[PDB]
mmCIF file of C-alpha atoms and ligand atoms in Angstrom:
data_model
loop_
_atom_site.group_PDB
_atom_site.id
_atom_site.type_symbol
_atom_site.label_atom_id
_atom_site.label_comp_id
_atom_site.label_asym_id
_atom_site.label_seq_id
_atom_site.Cartn_x
_atom_site.Cartn_y
_atom_site.Cartn_z
ATOM 1 C CA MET A 520 -3.523 -167.892 93.509
ATOM 2 C CA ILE A 521 -4.622 -165.248 95.663
ATOM 3 C CA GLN A 522 -3.338 -161.941 93.954
ATOM 4 C CA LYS A 523 -2.135 -159.243 95.833
ATOM 5 C CA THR A 524 -2.112 -155.699 94.577
ATOM 6 C CA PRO A 525 1.153 -153.671 94.146
ATOM 7 C CA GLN A 526 2.108 -150.768 96.520
ATOM 8 C CA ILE A 527 4.298 -148.225 94.519
ATOM 9 C CA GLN A 528 6.726 -145.677 95.754
ATOM 10 C CA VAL A 529 8.702 -143.486 93.479
ATOM 11 C CA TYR A 530 11.402 -141.203 95.178
ATOM 12 C CA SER A 531 14.795 -140.011 94.868
ATOM 13 C CA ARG A 532 17.805 -141.498 96.243
ATOM 14 C CA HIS A 533 19.018 -138.064 97.428
ATOM 15 C CA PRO A 534 16.889 -135.051 98.295
ATOM 16 C CA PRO A 535 16.240 -133.419 94.811
ATOM 17 C CA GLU A 536 17.801 -130.140 93.680
ATOM 18 C CA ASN A 537 17.080 -129.029 90.086
ATOM 19 C CA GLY A 538 20.099 -129.433 87.855
ATOM 20 C CA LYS A 539 21.803 -131.757 90.245
ATOM 21 C CA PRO A 540 22.038 -135.575 89.136
ATOM 22 C CA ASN A 541 20.384 -137.954 91.386
ATOM 23 C CA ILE A 542 18.736 -141.503 90.911
ATOM 24 C CA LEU A 543 15.293 -142.170 90.427
ATOM 25 C CA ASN A 544 13.614 -145.199 92.213
ATOM 26 C CA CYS A 545 10.468 -147.046 91.884
ATOM 27 C CA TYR A 546 9.944 -149.618 94.551
ATOM 28 C CA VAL A 547 7.091 -151.955 94.272
ATOM 29 C CA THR A 548 5.860 -153.958 97.238
ATOM 30 C CA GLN A 549 3.318 -156.469 98.298
ATOM 31 C CA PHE A 550 2.346 -157.975 94.989
ATOM 32 C CA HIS A 551 1.551 -161.499 94.006
ATOM 33 C CA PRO A 552 2.183 -163.454 91.748
ATOM 34 C CA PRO A 553 5.841 -162.063 91.136
ATOM 35 C CA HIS A 554 5.355 -161.629 87.207
ATOM 36 C CA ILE A 555 5.329 -157.729 86.947
ATOM 37 C CA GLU A 556 5.995 -154.948 84.318
ATOM 38 C CA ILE A 557 7.637 -151.753 85.521
ATOM 39 C CA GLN A 558 8.358 -148.836 83.156
ATOM 40 C CA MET A 559 9.895 -145.592 84.177
ATOM 41 C CA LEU A 560 9.072 -142.597 82.113
ATOM 42 C CA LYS A 561 10.251 -139.100 81.335
ATOM 43 C CA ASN A 562 7.578 -136.638 80.157
ATOM 44 C CA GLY A 563 5.311 -139.779 79.060
ATOM 45 C CA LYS A 564 8.175 -141.499 77.347
ATOM 46 C CA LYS A 565 9.813 -144.739 78.238
ATOM 47 C CA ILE A 566 13.010 -144.435 79.676
ATOM 48 C CA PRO A 567 15.527 -146.838 77.912
ATOM 49 C CA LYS A 568 18.105 -148.285 80.371
ATOM 50 C CA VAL A 569 16.357 -149.023 83.725
ATOM 51 C CA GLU A 570 18.150 -151.200 86.350
ATOM 52 C CA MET A 571 16.231 -153.787 88.506
ATOM 53 C CA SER A 572 17.377 -155.162 91.770
ATOM 54 C CA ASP A 573 16.496 -155.970 95.242
ATOM 55 C CA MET A 574 13.820 -158.566 94.181
ATOM 56 C CA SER A 575 12.727 -161.022 96.908
ATOM 57 C CA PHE A 576 9.806 -161.723 99.040
ATOM 58 C CA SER A 577 8.686 -160.707 102.492
ATOM 59 C CA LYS A 578 7.306 -162.714 105.472
ATOM 60 C CA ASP A 579 3.938 -162.863 104.294
ATOM 61 C CA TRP A 580 5.030 -164.265 100.924
ATOM 62 C CA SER A 581 4.306 -161.095 98.960
ATOM 63 C CA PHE A 582 6.872 -159.853 96.472
ATOM 64 C CA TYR A 583 9.031 -156.509 96.026
ATOM 65 C CA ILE A 584 11.515 -155.318 93.660
ATOM 66 C CA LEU A 585 13.229 -152.021 92.995
ATOM 67 C CA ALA A 586 13.781 -150.406 89.737
ATOM 68 C CA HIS A 587 16.085 -147.270 88.987
ATOM 69 C CA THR A 588 17.484 -144.842 86.784
ATOM 70 C CA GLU A 589 19.913 -141.804 86.541
ATOM 71 C CA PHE A 590 18.157 -138.465 86.221
ATOM 72 C CA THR A 591 18.378 -134.829 86.824
ATOM 73 C CA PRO A 592 15.490 -132.988 88.417
ATOM 74 C CA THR A 593 14.435 -129.909 86.325
ATOM 75 C CA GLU A 594 11.589 -127.601 87.106
ATOM 76 C CA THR A 595 9.815 -128.834 84.075
ATOM 77 C CA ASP A 596 10.483 -132.581 83.429
ATOM 78 C CA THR A 597 7.651 -134.950 84.866
ATOM 79 C CA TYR A 598 8.781 -138.434 85.918
ATOM 80 C CA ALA A 599 6.748 -141.473 86.574
ATOM 81 C CA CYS A 600 6.647 -145.167 86.925
ATOM 82 C CA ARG A 601 4.192 -147.368 85.334
ATOM 83 C CA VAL A 602 3.237 -150.848 86.554
ATOM 84 C CA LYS A 603 1.344 -153.494 85.060
ATOM 85 C CA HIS A 604 0.421 -156.486 87.069
ATOM 86 C CA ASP A 605 -2.035 -159.445 86.914
ATOM 87 C CA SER A 606 -3.850 -157.958 89.965
ATOM 88 C CA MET A 607 -4.833 -154.770 87.887
ATOM 89 C CA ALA A 608 -6.856 -154.820 84.693
ATOM 90 C CA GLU A 609 -5.061 -151.299 83.645
ATOM 91 C CA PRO A 610 -1.443 -150.376 84.278
ATOM 92 C CA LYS A 611 -1.101 -147.836 87.184
ATOM 93 C CA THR A 612 1.121 -144.849 86.781
ATOM 94 C CA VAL A 613 2.340 -143.100 89.743
ATOM 95 C CA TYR A 614 4.152 -139.674 89.132
ATOM 96 C CA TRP A 615 7.259 -138.477 91.007
ATOM 97 C CA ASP A 616 6.438 -135.945 94.014
ATOM 98 C CA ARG A 617 9.628 -134.056 95.283
ATOM 99 C CA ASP A 618 7.707 -134.390 98.416
ATOM 100 C CA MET A 619 7.422 -137.856 98.830
ATOM 101 C CA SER B 912 24.453 -158.510 116.999
ATOM 102 C CA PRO B 913 22.122 -160.136 116.014
ATOM 103 C CA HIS B 914 22.977 -161.439 112.475
ATOM 104 C CA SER B 915 21.208 -163.777 110.041
ATOM 105 C CA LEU B 916 21.712 -165.679 106.667
ATOM 106 C CA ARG B 917 18.573 -166.054 104.465
ATOM 107 C CA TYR B 918 17.985 -167.594 101.011
ATOM 108 C CA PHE B 919 14.547 -166.836 99.263
ATOM 109 C CA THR B 920 13.782 -169.424 96.442
ATOM 110 C CA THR B 921 10.878 -168.663 93.974
ATOM 111 C CA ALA B 922 9.806 -171.262 91.222
ATOM 112 C CA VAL B 923 6.990 -170.276 89.030
ATOM 113 C CA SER B 924 5.293 -172.631 86.415
ATOM 114 C CA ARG B 925 4.872 -171.452 82.869
ATOM 115 C CA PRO B 926 1.676 -173.387 81.101
ATOM 116 C CA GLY B 927 3.427 -173.827 77.814
ATOM 117 C CA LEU B 928 6.815 -174.351 78.698
ATOM 118 C CA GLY B 929 9.053 -177.028 80.140
ATOM 119 C CA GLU B 930 11.443 -175.369 82.684
ATOM 120 C CA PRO B 931 9.778 -173.252 85.270
ATOM 121 C CA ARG B 932 11.142 -169.748 86.045
ATOM 122 C CA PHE B 933 13.361 -170.407 89.110
ATOM 123 C CA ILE B 934 14.887 -167.646 91.068
ATOM 124 C CA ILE B 935 17.271 -167.468 94.386
ATOM 125 C CA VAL B 936 18.379 -164.518 96.120
ATOM 126 C CA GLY B 937 20.619 -164.834 99.372
ATOM 127 C CA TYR B 938 20.890 -162.166 102.284
ATOM 128 C CA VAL B 939 22.977 -161.436 105.139
ATOM 129 C CA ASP B 940 20.995 -159.186 107.422
ATOM 130 C CA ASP B 941 19.299 -156.746 104.996
ATOM 131 C CA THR B 942 21.957 -156.827 102.225
ATOM 132 C CA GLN B 943 21.494 -158.815 99.108
ATOM 133 C CA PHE B 944 24.584 -160.614 98.082
ATOM 134 C CA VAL B 945 23.699 -163.591 95.541
ATOM 135 C CA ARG B 946 21.073 -164.185 92.846
ATOM 136 C CA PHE B 947 20.390 -166.899 90.626
ATOM 137 C CA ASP B 948 17.797 -166.562 87.916
ATOM 138 C CA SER B 949 17.155 -169.427 85.411
ATOM 139 C CA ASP B 950 16.083 -167.028 82.822
ATOM 140 C CA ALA B 951 19.464 -164.824 82.901
ATOM 141 C CA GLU B 952 22.230 -163.863 80.916
ATOM 142 C CA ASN B 953 23.630 -165.998 82.305
ATOM 143 C CA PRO B 954 22.041 -168.598 84.481
ATOM 144 C CA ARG B 955 24.670 -168.890 87.180
ATOM 145 C CA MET B 956 24.982 -168.127 90.957
ATOM 146 C CA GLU B 957 26.281 -164.324 90.972
ATOM 147 C CA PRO B 958 27.511 -161.550 93.151
ATOM 148 C CA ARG B 959 24.982 -158.888 94.172
ATOM 149 C CA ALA B 960 27.570 -157.481 96.765
ATOM 150 C CA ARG B 961 31.135 -156.348 96.194
ATOM 151 C CA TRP B 962 32.377 -158.194 99.435
ATOM 152 C CA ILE B 963 31.452 -161.669 98.115
ATOM 153 C CA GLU B 964 33.561 -161.106 94.997
ATOM 154 C CA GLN B 965 36.153 -162.535 97.241
ATOM 155 C CA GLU B 966 34.982 -166.018 96.873
ATOM 156 C CA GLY B 967 36.842 -168.127 94.425
ATOM 157 C CA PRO B 968 35.532 -170.098 91.297
ATOM 158 C CA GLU B 969 35.019 -173.161 93.390
ATOM 159 C CA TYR B 970 32.499 -171.510 95.213
ATOM 160 C CA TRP B 971 30.554 -170.183 92.172
ATOM 161 C CA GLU B 972 30.717 -173.379 90.442
ATOM 162 C CA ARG B 973 29.428 -175.396 93.410
ATOM 163 C CA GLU B 974 26.608 -172.972 94.296
ATOM 164 C CA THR B 975 25.379 -172.900 90.635
ATOM 165 C CA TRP B 976 25.388 -176.377 90.323
ATOM 166 C CA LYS B 977 23.295 -176.618 93.552
ATOM 167 C CA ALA B 978 20.830 -173.837 92.103
ATOM 168 C CA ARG B 979 20.476 -175.978 89.110
ATOM 169 C CA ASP B 980 19.806 -179.026 91.020
ATOM 170 C CA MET B 981 17.263 -177.296 93.100
ATOM 171 C CA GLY B 982 15.527 -175.901 89.931
ATOM 172 C CA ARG B 983 15.001 -179.360 88.786
ATOM 173 C CA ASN B 984 13.657 -180.581 92.142
ATOM 174 C CA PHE B 985 11.387 -177.461 92.454
ATOM 175 C CA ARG B 986 9.899 -178.501 88.785
ATOM 176 C CA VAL B 987 9.170 -181.920 90.155
ATOM 177 C CA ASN B 988 7.437 -180.466 93.145
ATOM 178 C CA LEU B 989 5.523 -178.034 91.056
ATOM 179 C CA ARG B 990 4.122 -181.075 88.965
ATOM 180 C CA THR B 991 3.493 -183.168 92.250
ATOM 181 C CA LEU B 992 1.491 -180.370 93.507
ATOM 182 C CA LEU B 993 -0.542 -180.132 90.562
ATOM 183 C CA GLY B 994 -1.780 -183.625 91.283
ATOM 184 C CA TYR B 995 -2.362 -183.322 94.870
ATOM 185 C CA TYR B 996 -4.702 -180.261 94.114
ATOM 186 C CA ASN B 997 -5.981 -181.723 90.985
ATOM 187 C CA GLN B 998 -4.956 -178.688 88.985
ATOM 188 C CA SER B 999 -4.658 -178.596 85.088
ATOM 189 C CA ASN B 1000 -1.270 -177.672 83.476
ATOM 190 C CA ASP B 1001 -2.851 -174.609 81.844
ATOM 191 C CA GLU B 1002 -2.209 -172.210 84.546
ATOM 192 C CA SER B 1003 0.822 -170.554 86.426
ATOM 193 C CA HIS B 1004 1.612 -171.727 89.884
ATOM 194 C CA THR B 1005 4.108 -170.518 92.467
ATOM 195 C CA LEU B 1006 6.247 -172.288 95.019
ATOM 196 C CA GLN B 1007 8.311 -170.404 97.552
ATOM 197 C CA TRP B 1008 10.974 -171.327 99.997
ATOM 198 C CA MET B 1009 12.664 -169.435 102.692
ATOM 199 C CA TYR B 1010 15.335 -170.761 104.955
ATOM 200 C CA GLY B 1011 18.240 -169.508 107.095
ATOM 201 C CA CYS B 1012 19.562 -168.840 110.373
ATOM 202 C CA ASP B 1013 19.561 -166.087 113.108
ATOM 203 C CA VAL B 1014 22.706 -165.896 115.375
ATOM 204 C CA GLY B 1015 23.130 -164.387 118.487
ATOM 205 C CA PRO B 1016 26.034 -161.870 119.627
ATOM 206 C CA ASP B 1017 28.151 -164.909 120.520
ATOM 207 C CA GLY B 1018 27.867 -166.364 117.336
ATOM 208 C CA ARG B 1019 25.537 -169.207 118.214
ATOM 209 C CA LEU B 1020 22.201 -170.364 116.622
ATOM 210 C CA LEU B 1021 19.019 -168.441 117.926
ATOM 211 C CA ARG B 1022 16.729 -170.156 115.574
ATOM 212 C CA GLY B 1023 16.335 -171.620 112.427
ATOM 213 C CA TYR B 1024 13.743 -171.344 109.731
ATOM 214 C CA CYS B 1025 12.662 -173.505 106.695
ATOM 215 C CA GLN B 1026 9.222 -173.050 105.226
ATOM 216 C CA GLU B 1027 7.351 -173.044 101.756
ATOM 217 C CA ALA B 1028 4.165 -171.605 100.296
ATOM 218 C CA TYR B 1029 2.405 -172.882 97.349
ATOM 219 C CA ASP B 1030 0.419 -169.873 95.321
ATOM 220 C CA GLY B 1031 1.410 -167.345 97.974
ATOM 221 C CA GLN B 1032 -0.030 -169.501 100.969
ATOM 222 C CA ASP B 1033 1.528 -171.319 103.804
ATOM 223 C CA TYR B 1034 2.077 -174.899 102.660
ATOM 224 C CA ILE B 1035 4.785 -176.575 105.291
ATOM 225 C CA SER B 1036 7.133 -175.108 107.673
ATOM 226 C CA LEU B 1037 9.693 -176.713 109.865
ATOM 227 C CA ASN B 1038 8.929 -175.936 113.724
ATOM 228 C CA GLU B 1039 11.162 -174.195 115.954
ATOM 229 C CA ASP B 1040 12.358 -177.312 117.603
ATOM 230 C CA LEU B 1041 13.762 -178.136 114.050
ATOM 231 C CA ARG B 1042 12.383 -181.693 114.490
ATOM 232 C CA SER B 1043 8.909 -181.580 113.413
ATOM 233 C CA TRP B 1044 6.730 -180.075 110.795
ATOM 234 C CA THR B 1045 3.377 -178.094 110.345
ATOM 235 C CA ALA B 1046 1.229 -178.794 107.556
ATOM 236 C CA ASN B 1047 -1.851 -176.596 106.436
ATOM 237 C CA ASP B 1048 -4.011 -178.863 104.266
ATOM 238 C CA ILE B 1049 -4.383 -182.418 102.948
ATOM 239 C CA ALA B 1050 -1.636 -181.811 100.279
ATOM 240 C CA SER B 1051 0.766 -180.343 102.760
ATOM 241 C CA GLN B 1052 0.174 -183.246 105.005
ATOM 242 C CA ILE B 1053 1.370 -185.724 102.300
ATOM 243 C CA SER B 1054 4.467 -183.628 101.955
ATOM 244 C CA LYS B 1055 4.930 -183.562 105.644
ATOM 245 C CA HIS B 1056 4.320 -187.234 105.882
ATOM 246 C CA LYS B 1057 7.086 -187.925 103.084
ATOM 247 C CA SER B 1058 9.473 -185.656 104.857
ATOM 248 C CA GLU B 1059 8.996 -187.656 108.082
ATOM 249 C CA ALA B 1060 9.824 -190.783 106.326
ATOM 250 C CA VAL B 1061 12.854 -189.606 105.068
ATOM 251 C CA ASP B 1062 13.918 -187.659 108.131
ATOM 252 C CA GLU B 1063 14.154 -184.295 106.123
ATOM 253 C CA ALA B 1064 14.150 -182.370 109.587
ATOM 254 C CA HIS B 1065 17.344 -183.811 110.583
ATOM 255 C CA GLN B 1066 19.175 -182.716 107.136
ATOM 256 C CA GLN B 1067 17.514 -179.205 107.490
ATOM 257 C CA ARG B 1068 18.610 -179.050 110.898
ATOM 258 C CA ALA B 1069 22.079 -180.160 110.373
ATOM 259 C CA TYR B 1070 22.535 -177.522 107.762
ATOM 260 C CA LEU B 1071 20.862 -174.635 109.865
ATOM 261 C CA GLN B 1072 23.000 -175.632 112.789
ATOM 262 C CA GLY B 1073 26.130 -175.987 111.019
ATOM 263 C CA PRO B 1074 27.081 -174.677 107.728
ATOM 264 C CA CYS B 1075 24.411 -172.005 107.905
ATOM 265 C CA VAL B 1076 26.030 -170.593 111.064
ATOM 266 C CA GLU B 1077 29.434 -171.294 109.719
ATOM 267 C CA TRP B 1078 28.827 -169.410 106.240
ATOM 268 C CA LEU B 1079 27.335 -166.537 108.013
ATOM 269 C CA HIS B 1080 30.401 -166.114 109.927
ATOM 270 C CA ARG B 1081 32.456 -166.217 106.809
ATOM 271 C CA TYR B 1082 30.273 -163.601 105.226
ATOM 272 C CA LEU B 1083 30.304 -161.253 108.107
ATOM 273 C CA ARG B 1084 34.367 -161.462 108.009
ATOM 274 C CA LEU B 1085 34.461 -160.930 104.221
ATOM 275 C CA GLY B 1086 31.884 -158.064 104.462
ATOM 276 C CA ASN B 1087 32.748 -156.443 107.658
ATOM 277 C CA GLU B 1088 33.180 -153.088 106.855
ATOM 278 C CA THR B 1089 29.460 -152.844 105.415
ATOM 279 C CA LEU B 1090 27.566 -155.525 107.411
ATOM 280 C CA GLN B 1091 29.129 -154.874 110.717
ATOM 281 C CA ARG B 1092 28.213 -151.080 110.671
ATOM 282 C CA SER B 1093 25.385 -148.709 111.973
ATOM 283 C CA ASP B 1094 24.450 -145.658 110.049
ATOM 284 C CA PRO B 1095 22.154 -143.779 112.056
ATOM 285 C CA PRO B 1096 19.445 -141.748 110.112
ATOM 286 C CA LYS B 1097 19.482 -138.218 109.317
ATOM 287 C CA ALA B 1098 15.967 -136.747 109.925
ATOM 288 C CA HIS B 1099 13.992 -133.890 109.159
ATOM 289 C CA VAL B 1100 10.232 -132.715 109.343
ATOM 290 C CA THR B 1101 8.555 -131.361 105.961
ATOM 291 C CA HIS B 1102 5.325 -129.383 105.866
ATOM 292 C CA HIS B 1103 2.599 -129.925 103.262
ATOM 293 C CA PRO B 1104 -0.815 -128.003 103.276
ATOM 294 C CA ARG B 1105 -3.527 -130.617 103.013
ATOM 295 C CA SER B 1106 -6.579 -128.221 102.914
ATOM 296 C CA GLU B 1107 -7.506 -124.758 103.965
ATOM 297 C CA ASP B 1108 -6.780 -125.522 107.730
ATOM 298 C CA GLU B 1109 -4.936 -128.847 107.784
ATOM 299 C CA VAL B 1110 -1.365 -129.577 107.280
ATOM 300 C CA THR B 1111 0.644 -132.599 106.370
ATOM 301 C CA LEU B 1112 3.866 -133.007 108.654
ATOM 302 C CA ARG B 1113 6.345 -135.667 107.452
ATOM 303 C CA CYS B 1114 9.184 -136.988 109.492
ATOM 304 C CA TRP B 1115 11.744 -138.352 107.479
ATOM 305 C CA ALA B 1116 14.637 -140.833 108.286
ATOM 306 C CA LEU B 1117 17.477 -141.087 105.578
ATOM 307 C CA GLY B 1118 20.746 -142.695 104.972
ATOM 308 C CA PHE B 1119 20.339 -145.436 107.692
ATOM 309 C CA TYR B 1120 21.549 -149.155 107.864
ATOM 310 C CA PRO B 1121 20.373 -151.614 108.865
ATOM 311 C CA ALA B 1122 16.753 -151.315 107.937
ATOM 312 C CA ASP B 1123 14.928 -151.700 111.343
ATOM 313 C CA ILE B 1124 13.583 -148.282 112.234
ATOM 314 C CA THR B 1125 10.639 -147.068 114.194
ATOM 315 C CA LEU B 1126 9.172 -143.206 113.852
ATOM 316 C CA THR B 1127 6.594 -141.990 116.008
ATOM 317 C CA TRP B 1128 4.455 -139.024 116.051
ATOM 318 C CA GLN B 1129 2.373 -137.528 118.849
ATOM 319 C CA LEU B 1130 0.288 -134.696 120.069
ATOM 320 C CA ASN B 1131 2.601 -133.135 122.856
ATOM 321 C CA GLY B 1132 1.086 -134.441 126.398
ATOM 322 C CA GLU B 1133 -0.830 -137.117 124.452
ATOM 323 C CA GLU B 1134 -0.018 -140.963 123.823
ATOM 324 C CA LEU B 1135 1.656 -141.853 120.140
ATOM 325 C CA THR B 1136 -1.032 -141.228 117.566
ATOM 326 C CA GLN B 1137 -2.234 -144.552 115.603
ATOM 327 C CA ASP B 1138 -3.689 -142.012 112.930
ATOM 328 C CA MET B 1139 -0.529 -141.997 111.090
ATOM 329 C CA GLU B 1140 0.501 -142.607 107.497
ATOM 330 C CA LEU B 1141 3.734 -144.582 107.005
ATOM 331 C CA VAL B 1142 5.488 -145.970 104.193
ATOM 332 C CA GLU B 1143 7.201 -149.462 104.041
ATOM 333 C CA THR B 1144 11.100 -148.876 104.537
ATOM 334 C CA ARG B 1145 12.484 -148.526 101.244
ATOM 335 C CA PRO B 1146 16.017 -148.978 99.905
ATOM 336 C CA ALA B 1147 17.873 -145.690 98.583
ATOM 337 C CA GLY B 1148 19.923 -147.874 96.242
ATOM 338 C CA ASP B 1149 23.122 -147.101 97.710
ATOM 339 C CA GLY B 1150 22.934 -149.787 100.462
ATOM 340 C CA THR B 1151 21.104 -147.363 102.893
ATOM 341 C CA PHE B 1152 17.376 -147.186 103.666
ATOM 342 C CA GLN B 1153 14.648 -144.513 103.867
ATOM 343 C CA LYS B 1154 11.162 -144.297 105.593
ATOM 344 C CA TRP B 1155 8.616 -141.320 106.391
ATOM 345 C CA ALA B 1156 5.671 -141.044 109.006
ATOM 346 C CA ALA B 1157 3.078 -138.499 108.644
ATOM 347 C CA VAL B 1158 0.194 -136.990 110.410
ATOM 348 C CA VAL B 1159 -2.100 -134.592 109.295
ATOM 349 C CA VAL B 1160 -2.607 -131.503 111.968
ATOM 350 C CA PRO B 1161 -4.446 -128.155 112.120
ATOM 351 C CA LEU B 1162 -2.922 -125.232 110.486
ATOM 352 C CA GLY B 1163 -1.236 -123.154 113.105
ATOM 353 C CA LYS B 1164 -0.732 -125.867 115.652
ATOM 354 C CA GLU B 1165 2.200 -127.707 113.921
ATOM 355 C CA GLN B 1166 4.452 -127.261 116.811
ATOM 356 C CA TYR B 1167 2.278 -128.930 119.105
ATOM 357 C CA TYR B 1168 3.382 -132.330 117.430
ATOM 358 C CA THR B 1169 6.818 -134.229 117.852
ATOM 359 C CA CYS B 1170 8.442 -136.839 115.910
ATOM 360 C CA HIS B 1171 10.854 -139.342 117.359
ATOM 361 C CA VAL B 1172 13.247 -141.662 115.450
ATOM 362 C CA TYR B 1173 14.614 -144.847 116.899
ATOM 363 C CA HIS B 1174 17.425 -146.941 115.016
ATOM 364 C CA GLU B 1175 20.250 -149.288 116.347
ATOM 365 C CA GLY B 1176 22.578 -146.277 115.469
ATOM 366 C CA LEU B 1177 20.905 -144.002 118.046
ATOM 367 C CA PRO B 1178 21.839 -144.301 121.751
ATOM 368 C CA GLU B 1179 18.890 -141.942 122.129
ATOM 369 C CA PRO B 1180 16.248 -141.184 119.432
ATOM 370 C CA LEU B 1181 16.187 -138.390 117.484
ATOM 371 C CA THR B 1182 13.422 -135.773 118.657
ATOM 372 C CA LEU B 1183 12.174 -133.546 115.860
ATOM 373 C CA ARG B 1184 9.278 -130.861 115.054
ATOM 374 C CA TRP B 1185 8.335 -128.826 112.086
ATOM 375 C CA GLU B 1186 10.704 -125.603 112.382
ATOM 376 C CA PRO B 1187 9.416 -122.785 109.926
ATOM 377 C CA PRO B 1188 12.134 -121.276 107.634
ATOM 378 C CA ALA C 119 26.194 -170.871 101.094
ATOM 379 C CA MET C 120 22.810 -172.887 100.035
ATOM 380 C CA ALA C 121 21.533 -175.738 101.837
ATOM 381 C CA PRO C 122 22.450 -179.043 100.242
ATOM 382 C CA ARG C 123 18.792 -180.107 99.399
ATOM 383 C CA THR C 124 15.265 -178.936 99.219
ATOM 384 C CA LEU C 125 12.117 -180.984 100.585
ATOM 385 C CA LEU C 126 10.642 -183.291 97.900
ATOM 386 C CA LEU C 127 6.990 -182.246 98.397
HETATM 387 NI NI1 NI D 329 4.871 -159.750 80.937
HETATM 388 NI NI1 NI D 330 22.482 -148.374 89.397
HETATM 389 NI NI1 NI D 331 2.051 -129.450 96.876
HETATM 390 NI NI1 NI D 332 10.807 -137.614 123.777
#
C-alpha cells in the first residue's frame, strides 16, 4: 500500500466556555490504510466511553473518521487525542486548544 | 439542488483470518444515513440518520443480505488480485468501491460514478458515458476485459440511471427537513499573537449545512492571498460543519485584511475583519 | 438502496 499519514483536528462542537457542557471532537483525515487507533484523554488518562462515527473515504481514496465525547471545559483540565497508525512509528498526541 | 446518493465500500484482508473486514457507508449529499460493518455488534445494515428509520424491516433485511453478498464477492476479489499481482497471503490489502448518482434540480441524472481502488490506488473506473471502463495497469486490464465480457457496464448503468435516482428521490422525501435545507454559517474573526510583531487572524465559519463553503482572505487592495492556512471542513457532530482559514499579518495592521465567507445559504457572502474588543 | 451486484475483478 502507499501509506498516508493522518491529519488530526481536536475541537469543540460549540465555542468553549468554562463550566458549560460541550462535546469534544477528534477528526482524523487523509490516512491509509483504514485501520487506526484513536484514544481521547483527560489529563493524560484515557476517556472511557468515546463514540466513533462519520467514517468513510475521500475522492483521493484516503480515509477519515470522527471520535467524540462529552466534556465540560475547565480552566485547569487538559484534553488531547492520541492517534496510532501504521504510517507512524510512534503515536501522535494532539492537545486541545480553545483557539482552534 | 443538486443532490447525490453515494455508497462507500471498503474491504480489508487480514492475514491470519478468513473473512476480510467489510464496511459500507451510504450518504445522501453530506449526510451519512446507513452503515454496515462485518465486525460489528451486530453485522447488519443499520441507520445512521433518524429519517431512514422510516423504512420497514423488508428494506433492512434486503440491504443486509445484499451487504453480506457483496462482502463474499469482495473476499473473492481480494484473493483474485493477490494472484494478479503475485502477492503473498501474509499481508493486508484494501479494495475500495465508490459509486452513486448526482441528480439535477429537475430530478434527472447528471452523472454516475462507479470506481474502485486497490491499496489506495486507482484500479478501475466506469467512464462518464457509463458504457466503457478505464484501467490503470495490467491487473485492472484483466478486470476491465472480464467486465466487458459480461457487460457489467450495462448492469451498473441501469442501476445508476434508474434505482439510484429513484431511491435518492425517496430519501430526499423521507429526510426533506434536514436534507433540503441550507443553514448558513455564522462567522467571526479571532486574533492570536504569533510573534513579537505578527498576528494570526483566523476566520471561522460555524453551524453550516451543506458542507461546501469557501473562505477567502485578502489584504485590502490586493488579490486573494494564497498564503493561507486552512483546515479541512469538519463535522461539528450535530449535522452541521465548521471551517477556518488563517493568515499571519503584521501587528497593528490587522484591519487592512478582510475575510469573505461564501455558502449556498448566503445570497451574498459574509464580509468580516478583526474587531478589537 | 445499494447496487445489486459488484464487479467481479
Ligand atoms: Ni489496532
Ligand atoms: Ni454523541
Ligand atoms: Ni495562546
Ligand atoms: Ni467584499
